[PDB]
A paper describes a structure:
Mupirocin, a clinically used natural antibiotic, inhibits [name] ([name]), an enzyme that links isoleucine to its tRNAIle for protein synthesis. Two IleRSs, mupirocin-sensitive IleRS1 and resistant IleRS2, coexist in bacteria.
We mimic the motif alteration by the exchange of the first and third motif positions in PmIleRS2 that naturally carries the canonical HVGH motif.
Residue numbers in the entry: 1 to 1032
């Protein structure tokens, strides 16, 4: 073993260990050495390469590393291939800001290929930043040969999946009303929309719709989106609902019967009752006549019209509502659109042309009143969808898109999810399960440039569709030569046309790229270029035994994985999911926010070490709920856990070399009770940590280990230092080294998945082997002594009670005290075995165990004025004083009898009720008491001259021992000590001359009145001059 003497920072140690991993290929060998062992299949969720890693990203990568390392140590081969997510809006928008451009026109003017080259350069910069962060965090994952979603092989496997889906008829193009981002200028998927809801406050209005061929008759239409009014095509009523023609003032309004008293206030008279199918066909005048509807502006029947809200008459604009689109299409009404792709009004609405529709709400109200059509307005606080990337409000916009028909397999989705073990369990039928139950088809087409091209070619002649699964299939159908090096990106694939197999017409690729979530959801099949390569390796690496990512993936990777795999293969791609809560910064969620909530993880790793950061993330709180994180918790983890292990390890190394201990040599072992306790605590910790890890309880396993580390340092090592400091290699010293060597080897093995750097530093120095190539230690039940653990735990509580009393009464442990009395309610612990430990630790001359406190307490009596005040009238204070005058035995008799009589000064004797007297139990004179309820510790706090002088003698002994180290004197050299002090020190030294000689290797001791050129030292509140003249 090597030394720990030269001061090494945490960063220096981890850098040294990392280089040791590099030169030994330990990560690679920890996988190869498990060849033939059962597989544990793990998929890495690919971080988006669009920003710097933060501290919040260290939680997931720590948890993944713990599982992989732990599963490797318990006899599994865990292949770990890193991945980077490089396509889509999360990358495109960032690059646009770097270039100072925005929108599809700016990108096309910039040049599609030039813009894409900027995307490739940006993601490459972030991959290196992420890779450096991952390596220094100690998350072992293969970033030398990662899967990257922009690589041609990866995209080709995505094409094969999409083509196979298309073969099943589950990839279709359709004109549907979809969630749409006017800024990004593309439709969005259902899971993307579920990530961008915010509370808004807008206006829902009621508008008069004057009936045609009638006078003073106005329909009362209702809408939550006033900006859709210029595009009105129809009014919807429920055919079986009841409506009334009610006159109000000079006008007559048509409104639902059940809502009339709410819509019409002040004064109205109901004339006639009508059903919904009677009002069907009635025409009216639009609130805005800017646009013309060739077949529309009538009243139609829709079954979703509710009488609980609104007026029972609903304005329908087919281009901005799925229900509106359906009903208008059913009745053969004209489809009209007044909004461009940027969310702005077209020329068909002159007064607001070129304005965002959701910004015209205020002006729409004014135009309504000025045209004599407005009737009501009310506030609406509701959740509204916003773009999950650019935070723009979304619109529901009729648009032609490509869909994956996930609803066709919805039953298979739910079946696959039911086979998944979720952590926490509530995600399974909660956040994830509810999303599955409300499934709509997956809108995958994005009118963007950087992403996986949607591999569907349509014939210009007959609209026949061809979806090449591969470059070879693309080459086979192409009307021109397609080189083998064709890059599966825009615009390169846009220059490939195919000859139609039906009519020999020209087939052109649809221009869109696919949702970025499809890329990552395809990674089980695309990370190994399946089915083009690695068919056998893919089979051994599917499905995953676990994945672990943040809770946002329930609307992300968790869903896209499930959807791609179910559509492609029908099977669940994972057996188990760890859904991780998000890391917070004292409040908000860490992210690439404007505030930039996240801290620099590399700076923290540099300052406190990756081990400390990982331990804080694992032990401070569980990973399932939102986690407030602080640098302070990392600092505490470094000093309490990591530094503690290093010191104990360095303590073992220093004295093993000095004593020449060799674990390969055979010694005589006189193992003490403290050795048996810590060994029992070691294997009990091994058992309980393993049980937690088997159930993915990292927090509980870490906390169990931290308890053992505190016991190892504060109790076992601290109380065994003399055996390491002693001179001869006797049986008890050999037992100390043997015990501590086993503790360090096994504890480092226990800690390897948690704190891989410091664990390997201890293990490799002690054993010559990497801890990460080792087996996870097994519990040796024969070394578990439950009684010894129980008794020692009681001893620790008693010691803690004794320290509490000494601290309370300012009695430093260096000052011996006469006795400690322990009142145990029951004879449970064999206290005789631990008498020497308790007396040493608390510095008491006598330790006595009592069944009760009758000899250790007394009673004083008082009066409860709230109870007995009025009863005794004015003699109350005389009675209260009379109770306080009572003897000790009189007070004790009262608590037994429960009845007492006080004799006042006048000779009058008054009887005291039980509830009239307040009882106080006080410790005997000179004693002090602390109790937890199970154990009551009574400490004799009274000091005698002999106790004070012994304490002074102890301080003199310590002062001499410290001045001896300062002079660098040999350990074995009898000194001639000269000592000067006042009479109190002189008397104490004289009286305890034997004690001083037993603790100091003194050839002579001389008490001089004054000392030439002496060293003044502090002995309590006194100054003592010392001087050492080496014997000749
Ligand atoms: C599985 C990864 C997805 C396919 C996608 N590339 C993605 O979300 N990539 S990421 O880089 O933004 N996220 C990386 C991981 O970090 C989690 N995460 C993101 N934000 C936080 C946060 N504030 N606290 C804790 N964990 C968080 C993600 O869920 C993902 O596991
Ligand atoms: Zn957007
Ligand atoms: Zn054709």
């Amino acid at each position: 073993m090597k030394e720990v003497n030269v001061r090494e920072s945490s960063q220096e140690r981890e850098q040294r260990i990392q280089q040791q991993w590099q030169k030994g290929n330990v990560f690679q060998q920890s996988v190869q050495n498990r060849e033939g062992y059962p597989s544990f299949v793990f998929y890495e969720g690919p971080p988006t390469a669009n920003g710097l890693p933060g501290v919040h990203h260290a939680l997931g990568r720590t948890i993944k590393d713990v599982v992989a390392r732990y599963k490797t140590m318990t006899g599994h081969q865990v292949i770990r291939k890193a991945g980077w997510d490089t396509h889509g809006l999360p990358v495109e928008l960032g690059v646009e800001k770097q270039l100072g451009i925005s929108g599809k026109h700016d990108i096309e003017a910039y040049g599609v290929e030039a813009f894409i080259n900027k995307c490739k350069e940006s993601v490459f910069v972030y991959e290196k930043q992420w890779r450096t962060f991952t390596e220094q965090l100690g998350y072992w994952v293969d970033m030398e040969d990662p899967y990257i979603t922009l690589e041609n092989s990866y995209i080709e496997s995505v094409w094969n999946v999409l083509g196979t889906i298309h073969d099943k008829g589950l990839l279709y193009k359709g004109h549907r009303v979809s969630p749409y981002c006017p800024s990004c200028q593309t439709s969005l998927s259902s899971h993307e929309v579920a990530q961008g809801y915010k509370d808004v406050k807008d206006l829902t209005v009621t508008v008069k719709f004057k009936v045609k061929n009638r006078d003073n008759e106005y329909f009362l239409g209702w809408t939550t989106t006033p900006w859709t009014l210029p595009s009105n095509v129809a009014l919807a009523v429920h055919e079986e609902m009841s409506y009334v023609r009610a006159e109000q003032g000079d006008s007559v309004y048509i409104v639902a019967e059940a809502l009339a008293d709410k819509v019409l206030k002040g004064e109205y008279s109901v004339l006639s009752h009508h059903k919904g199918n009677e009002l069907k066909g009635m025409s009216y005048e639009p609130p805005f006549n800017f646009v013309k509807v060739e077949k529309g502006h009538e009243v139609v029947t829709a079954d979703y019209v509710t009488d609980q809200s609104g007026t029972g008459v609903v304005h329908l604009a087919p281009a901005y509502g799925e229900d509106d689109y359906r009903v208008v299409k059913e009745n053969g009404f004209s489809f009209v659109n007044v909004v461009d792709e940027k969310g702005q009004y077209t020329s068909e609405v002159p007064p607001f042309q070129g304005r965002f529709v959701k910004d015209c709400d205020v002006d729409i109200v004014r135009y309504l009143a000025n045209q004599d059509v407005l009737y009501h307005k009310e506030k609406h606080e509701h959740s509204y969808p916003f773009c999950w990337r650019c935070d723009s409000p979304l619109l529901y916009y009729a648009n032609e898109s490509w869909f994956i028909q996930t609803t066709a397999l919805k039953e298979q989705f739910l079946k696959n999810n039911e086979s998944v073990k979720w952590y926490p369990d509530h995600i399974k039928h909660g956040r994830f399960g509810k999303f599955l139950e409300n499934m709509v088809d997956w809108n995958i087409s994005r009118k963007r440039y950087w992403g996986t091209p949607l591999n569907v070619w349509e014939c210009e002649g007959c609209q026949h569709q061809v979806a090449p699964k591969s470059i070879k299939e693309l080459q086979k159908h192409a009307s021109h030569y397609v080189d083998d090096s064709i890059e599966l990106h825009k615009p390169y694939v846009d220059d490939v046309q195919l000859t139609c197999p039906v009519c020999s017409g020209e087939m052109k690729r649809t221009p869109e790229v696919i949702d970025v979530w499809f890329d990552s959801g395809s990674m089980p099949f695309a990370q190994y270029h399946y089915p083009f390569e690695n068919s056998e390796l893919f089979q051994k690496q599917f499905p995953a035994d676990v994945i672990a990512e943040g809770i946002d993936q329930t609307r992300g990777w968790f869903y896209s994985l499930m959807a791609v795999s179910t559509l492609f293969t029908g099977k669940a791609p994972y057996k188990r999911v760890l859904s991780l809560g998000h890391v917070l910064d004292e409040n908000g969620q860490k992210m690439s926010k404007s505030k930039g909530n996240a801290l620099d993880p590399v700076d923290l790793i540099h300052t406190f070490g990756a081990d400390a950061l990982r331990w804080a993330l694992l032990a401070d709180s569980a990973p399932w709920n939102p986690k407030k994180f602080s640098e302070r918790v990392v600092q505490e983890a470094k000093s309490k856990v990591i530094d503690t292990l290093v010191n104990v390890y360095g303590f073992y190394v220093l004295y093993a070399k000095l004593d020449g201990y060799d674990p390969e040599q055979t010694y005589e072992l006189k193992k003490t009770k403290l050795d048996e306790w810590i060994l029992s605590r070691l294997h009990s910790t091994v058992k309980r940590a393993t049980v937690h890890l088997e159930d993915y309880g990292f927090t509980s396993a870490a906390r169990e280990i931290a308890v053992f580390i505190e016991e190892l340092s504060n109790w076992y090592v601290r109380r065994s230092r003399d055996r390491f400091w002693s001179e001869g290699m006797d049986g008890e010293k050999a037992a100390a080294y043997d015990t501590l060597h086993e503790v360090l080897v096994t504890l480092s093995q226990l800690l390897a998945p948690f704190t891989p750097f410091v664990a390997d530093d201890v293990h490799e120095n002690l054993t010559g082997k990497s801890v990460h190539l080792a087996d996870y230690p097994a519990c040796d039940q024969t070394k578990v002594n439950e009684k010894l653990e129980k008794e020692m735990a009681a001893v620790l509580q008693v010691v803690e009670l004794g320290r509490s009393i000494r601290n309370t009464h300012s009695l430093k442990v260096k000052q011996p005290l006469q006795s400690l009395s322990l009142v145990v309610t029951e004879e449970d612990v064999e206290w005789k075995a631990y008498r020497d430990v308790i007396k040493d630790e608390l510095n008491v001359k006598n330790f006595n165990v009592e069944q009760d406190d009758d000899k250790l307490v007394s009673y004083v009596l008082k009066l409860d004025f709230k109870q007995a005040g009025p009863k005794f009238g004015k003699q109350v204070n005389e009675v209260n004083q009379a109770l306080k005058n009572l003897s000790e035995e009189k007070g004790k008799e009262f608590v037994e009898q429960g009845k007492l009589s006080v004799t006042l000064a006048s000779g009058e004797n008054l009887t005291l009720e039980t509830e009239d007297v307040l009882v106080e139990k006080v410790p005997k004179e000179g004693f002090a008491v602390a109790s937890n309820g199970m154990y009551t510790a009574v400490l004799d706090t009274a000091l005698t001259e002999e106790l004070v002088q012994e304490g002074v003698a102890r301080e003199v002994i310590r002062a001499v021992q410290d001045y001896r180290k300062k002079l660098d004197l040999p350990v074995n050299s009898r000194i001639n000590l000269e000592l000067s002090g006042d009479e109190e020190v002189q008397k104490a030294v004289a009286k305890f001359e034997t004690l001083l000689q037993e603790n100091l290797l003194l050839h002579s001791l001389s008490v001089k009145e004054t000392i030439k050129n002496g060293e003044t030292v502090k002995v309590g509140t006194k100054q003592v001059v010392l001087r050492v003249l080496n014997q000749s």
